[PDB]
Amino acid sequence: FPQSAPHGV
């Protein structure tokens, strides 16, 4: 089950 970073680099 996946996850995306809260903020951009």
Place this chain on the structure above:
Amino acid sequence: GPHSLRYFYTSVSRPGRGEPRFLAVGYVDDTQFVRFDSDAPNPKAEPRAPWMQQPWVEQEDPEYFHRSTRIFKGAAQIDRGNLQTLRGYYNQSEDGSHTIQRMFGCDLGPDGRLLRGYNQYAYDGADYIALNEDLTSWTAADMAAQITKRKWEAAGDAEHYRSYLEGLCVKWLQIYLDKGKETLQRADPPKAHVTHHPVSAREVTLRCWALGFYPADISLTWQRDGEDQTQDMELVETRPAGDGTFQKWAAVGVPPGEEQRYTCHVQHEGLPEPLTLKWE
């Protein structure tokens, strides 16, 4: 034994050719189970193992794919921003293609608790930023990634990864290992044979084959009269058969007549005991 859940995010810019493309794949151990591609017409998370195509999925979460879809579209959007900002950090032209990769997931102990989390990034194939095993500080690889570290540390981003790992990550890995038991835990041994390939008067190649084994992990070695020849044997990388098993071989050139002095050794978690075998 020690299992892993890993997602692999790749985004690639294509100056002129249009918007960046984003690809994701999920693996449990050596077994792929999902994929995502921002270039597919109506792009969704897609099962890519049989045991992801089965009613248990609906039953545990009926929104499984819609949610995974949502998250991949997010990751895809964020990476389009990452590719712009990384150009800036590195003071790069708009002209060249660049690549952002992310690899993240968790390992489980035989305890079956979280052993270890990963969350790491590469830019153009080189180490950029990784979450440390404290799960609170980042290792920046260079002075661009240091900006990212200062930013992420100040905003406490690490915390949102922590709770995904301690919450969802372990949780779903156990679900997968349970429901995918016949594929993921049920470990096929290598079927091993030796083949004999003349080259000249001086050398016959003895090639030890290991076929149809899962997982990929294996040790394949020749010994002459109990003495390892690893420094003087040819050993290809483990390669997929295409059916979810792996292949490997190890070859040694021996004098003709000497064939019964060589024993091939095969060790794999799927063998009751290590295989030893010889020519014919």
Place this chain on the structure above:
Amino acid sequence: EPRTPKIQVYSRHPAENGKPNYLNCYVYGFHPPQIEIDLLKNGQKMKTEQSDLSFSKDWSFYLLVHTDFTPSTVDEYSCRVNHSSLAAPHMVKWDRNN
């Protein structure tokens, strides 16, 4: 500084002239991810399937390219790979012993 792909061309099962099999071209350890991988019969492009792009601990990519085939004494099979790391396309002959 691109990384040069490694190439293995091999069948799913041991080759028997006449028996339908699966021809595989595994190409791994490359960067960047843009790559041309074809399977060739007598030097002509076959219809293939490609795995979903993935990568290893060291960030190098790997793909598997495969199709149905039937080995025969008359026919040559090869894998053609072109990548930014290569001066020009490399071809690797299918040998049943490989």
